[PDB]
Design an enzyme around this catalytic site. Structure first.
Site, PDB file in Angstrom:
ATOM      1  CE  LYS A  92      -4.171  -1.929   2.132  1.00  0.00           C
ATOM      2  NZ  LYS A  92      -3.709  -3.342   2.212  1.00  0.00           N
TER       3      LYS A  92
ATOM      4  N   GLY B 272       6.091  10.385  -5.110  1.00  0.00           N
ATOM      5  CA  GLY B 272       6.777   9.588  -6.113  1.00  0.00           C
ATOM      6  C   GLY B 272       8.228   9.232  -5.844  1.00  0.00           C
TER       7      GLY B 272
ATOM      8  CB  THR C  76       9.239   8.733  -0.669  1.00  0.00           C
ATOM      9  OG1 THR C  76       9.880   9.935  -0.211  1.00  0.00           O
ATOM     10  CG2 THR C  76       9.229   7.702   0.472  1.00  0.00           C
TER      11      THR C  76
HETATM   12  O1  LIG Z   1      -9.965  -3.014   2.202  1.00  0.00           O
HETATM   13  C1  LIG Z   1      -9.050  -3.689   2.619  1.00  0.00           C
HETATM   14  C2  LIG Z   1      -9.089  -4.507   3.802  1.00  0.00           C
HETATM   15  N1  LIG Z   1      -8.086  -5.344   4.055  1.00  0.00           N
HETATM   16  N2  LIG Z   1      -6.956  -5.406   3.212  1.00  0.00           N
HETATM   17  C3  LIG Z   1      -5.939  -6.364   3.581  1.00  0.00           C
HETATM   18  O2  LIG Z   1      -6.403  -7.656   3.212  1.00  0.00           O
HETATM   19  C4  LIG Z   1      -6.239  -8.568   4.301  1.00  0.00           C
HETATM   20  C5  LIG Z   1      -7.614  -8.883   4.885  1.00  0.00           C
HETATM   21  O3  LIG Z   1      -7.368  -9.905   5.828  1.00  0.00           O
HETATM   22  P1  LIG Z   1      -8.532 -10.581   6.739  1.00  0.00           P
HETATM   23  O4  LIG Z   1      -9.352 -11.503   5.765  1.00  0.00           O
HETATM   24  O5  LIG Z   1      -7.732 -11.427   7.671  1.00  0.00           O
HETATM   25  O6  LIG Z   1      -9.363  -9.527   7.416  1.00  0.00           O
HETATM   26  C6  LIG Z   1      -5.228  -7.908   5.234  1.00  0.00           C
HETATM   27  O7  LIG Z   1      -3.911  -8.257   4.827  1.00  0.00           O
HETATM   28  C7  LIG Z   1      -5.484  -6.431   5.044  1.00  0.00           C
HETATM   29  O8  LIG Z   1      -4.292  -5.653   5.252  1.00  0.00           O
HETATM   30  C8  LIG Z   1      -6.819  -4.601   2.073  1.00  0.00           C
HETATM   31  O9  LIG Z   1      -5.912  -4.696   1.307  1.00  0.00           O
HETATM   32  N3  LIG Z   1      -7.850  -3.694   1.902  1.00  0.00           N
HETATM   33  O1  LIG Z   2       3.339  15.960   1.759  1.00  0.00           O
HETATM   34  C1  LIG Z   2       4.346  15.310   1.913  1.00  0.00           C
HETATM   35  C2  LIG Z   2       5.494  15.326   1.042  1.00  0.00           C
HETATM   36  N1  LIG Z   2       6.585  14.644   1.381  1.00  0.00           N
HETATM   37  N2  LIG Z   2       6.642  13.905   2.579  1.00  0.00           N
HETATM   38  C3  LIG Z   2       7.914  13.291   2.887  1.00  0.00           C
HETATM   39  O2  LIG Z   2       8.780  14.310   3.367  1.00  0.00           O
HETATM   40  C4  LIG Z   2      10.046  14.230   2.706  1.00  0.00           C
HETATM   41  C5  LIG Z   2      10.172  15.406   1.746  1.00  0.00           C
HETATM   42  O3  LIG Z   2      11.483  15.303   1.229  1.00  0.00           O
HETATM   43  P1  LIG Z   2      12.117  16.366   0.175  1.00  0.00           P
HETATM   44  O4  LIG Z   2      12.344  17.694   0.997  1.00  0.00           O
HETATM   45  O5  LIG Z   2      13.447  15.733  -0.125  1.00  0.00           O
HETATM   46  O6  LIG Z   2      11.227  16.541  -1.020  1.00  0.00           O
HETATM   47  C6  LIG Z   2      10.099  12.832   2.091  1.00  0.00           C
HETATM   48  O7  LIG Z   2      10.624  11.916   3.041  1.00  0.00           O
HETATM   49  C7  LIG Z   2       8.655  12.531   1.782  1.00  0.00           C
HETATM   50  O8  LIG Z   2       8.391  11.120   1.843  1.00  0.00           O
HETATM   51  C8  LIG Z   2       5.550  13.790   3.448  1.00  0.00           C
HETATM   52  O9  LIG Z   2       5.589  13.185   4.472  1.00  0.00           O
HETATM   53  N3  LIG Z   2       4.422  14.470   3.027  1.00  0.00           N
END
Ligand SMILES: O=c1cnn([C@@H]2O[C@H](COP(=O)(O)O)[C@@H](O)[C@H]2O)c(=O)[nH]1
Ligand SMILES: O=c1cnn([C@@H]2O[C@H](COP(=O)(O)O)[C@@H](O)[C@H]2O)c(=O)[nH]1
EC number: 4.1.1.23
Lengths: 257, 257
Positions: A89, A94, A96
């Site tokens: 997820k 982008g 990062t």
């Molecule tokens: O909308 C959702 C809900 N769950 N999951 C993921 O799917 C699995 C659902 O597992 P469960 O059947 O044990 O609840 C977990 O890995 C959870 O992070 C998703 O990707 N999106």
């Molecule tokens: O809205 C934002 C944008 N960037 N970041 C994070 O903050 C850092 C921004 O880095 P930069 O100054 O090198 O662009 C990176 O670790 C990025 O994942 C966030 O948490 N939220």
């Protein structure tokens, strides 16, 4: 049908998946969310012949390693014929996600056929992930956008969902579909999106942390192509192998109807 | 002032952070996003005296380890007096994030004073993360919700932002504030949310993957309590130590104004 969609889908990953589903008569994706590589591999072995896709959370493993976790997973993938989907997820800018997907400890882009991303970041997340994929491997890769969630109070609805679907439209060869709770349309614009649906359980109603379950017949009835089942297969003392066949049968028959 | 807010904030983590900001005259958070523990430790050492918080992405490290990465980071944290913020951006259902935050290989809850989460999942994400924190450590922990993003095409706006703010309202002691681009209000409801703002650069305009930068003066004028700066400090051949003082000076003076 799955077989027909395999021949017309722009993504070679989606195409291979559709073929696997047809060949094995299954649209079941196992989410064996356990904390040790040993147990994970045992469960995957038990579910192998009954699944078309294995969704993993390698970041909940206390003992992850490329040689001890990934290699054995790839071997099982080839042996039992199913693809690998790392459910990371991605949800950062982008630059990062490019770094997170391409290397680090998990080196996800090197072995996962499919991964996913939240649309919250904007178009850059797709560009970053694809650049990482092309820089690390010559193997085809697919991406699923998270259009909807099964959890209580999810904000992945309305305008947000629409915005996420728009992001998906930018790359037909790379973005193969969505993690969603219903059909997302798109046929009118030349899109054949795979719809994978988590929050599927025939017994559990939910958990103590916002999870909610819908039956197999229910989700397939609303457009689901693949059912993602986790705890319904291996938790609460359940026998994964038996549950695997049970869910495969339910999902396949629902599809045939 | 930061010193005054330290005495009235319900979170002991936020309180400590405000005190650090006052004592060191800095509202600068360094985001030293490099891929090796060796370079990371060198940069943290150089920035230590000038920061109030270190934001890390331990999952971009090719050689992460508890003993080789975390232990040294904690030592630097104590030596130079700054807190640790692991920018993992949790965004999965409560049960999954509980597992991802508490253990795996990174064991984030064991060492990170602060972490963050996307609101997309719903209130269960806060419950899951807090449960993980309490089962793993007795040390106080703080959580930031991602209300807004600096990237082009961000979907973290309107209704989604509102929904995320509502999720934050569920726990005043644990949810200390937001990663946002502007003030989020809340004063009338008894909230003193910390506003930490990424996408800050005095030179770069953006990057090739959707990042956009605003100046220090600009973000502070819109309500930012802490400025998060990454590449503006260490990338493109820049001298991290020099940039550290430069940004600290700019951020503190803007605050004083
Ligand atoms: O909308 C959702 C809900 N769950 N999951 C993921 O799917 C699995 C659902 O597992 P469960 O059947 O044990 O609840 C977990 O890995 C959870 O992070 C998703 O990707 N999106
Ligand atoms: O809205 C934002 C944008 N960037 N970041 C994070 O903050 C850092 C921004 O880095 P930069 O100054 O090198 O662009 C990176 O670790 C990025 O994942 C966030 O948490 N939220």
């Amino acid at each position: 049908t799955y077989k027909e969609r395999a021949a017309t889908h722009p993504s070679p990953v989606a195409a291979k998946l559709f073929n696997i589903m047809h060949e094995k008569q299954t649209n079941l994706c196992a989410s064996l969310d356990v904390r040790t590589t040993k147990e994970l591999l045992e469960l995957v072995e038990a579910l192998g012949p009954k699944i078309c896709l294995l969704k993993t959370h390698v970041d909940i493993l206390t003992d992850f390693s490329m040689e001890g976790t990934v290699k054995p997973l790839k071997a099982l993938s080839a042996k039992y014929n199913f693809l690998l989907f790392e459910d990371r997820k991605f949800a950062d800018i982008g630059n990062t996600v490019k770094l997170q997907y391409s290397a680090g400890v998990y080196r996800i882009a090197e072995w996962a056929d499919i991964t996913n991303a939240h649309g919250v970041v904007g178009p850059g997340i797709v560009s970053g992930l694809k650049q990482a994929a092309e820089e690390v491997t010559k193997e085809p890769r697919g991406l699923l956008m998270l259009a909807e969630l099964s959890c209580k109070g999810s904000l992945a609805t309305g305008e947000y969902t629409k915005g996420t679907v728009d992001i998906a439209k930018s790359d037909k060869d790379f973005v193969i579909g969505f993690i969603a709770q219903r059909d997302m349309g798109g046929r009118d614009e030349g899109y054949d999106w795979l719809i994978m649906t988590p929050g599927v359980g025939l017994d559990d109603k939910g958990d103590a942390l916002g999870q909610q379950y819908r039956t197999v017949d229910d989700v397939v009835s609303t457009g689901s192509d693949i059912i993602i089942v986790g705890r319904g297969l291996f938790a609460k003392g359940r026998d994964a192998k038996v549950e695997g066949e049970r869910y495969r049968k339910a999902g396949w028959e629902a599809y045939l109807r």
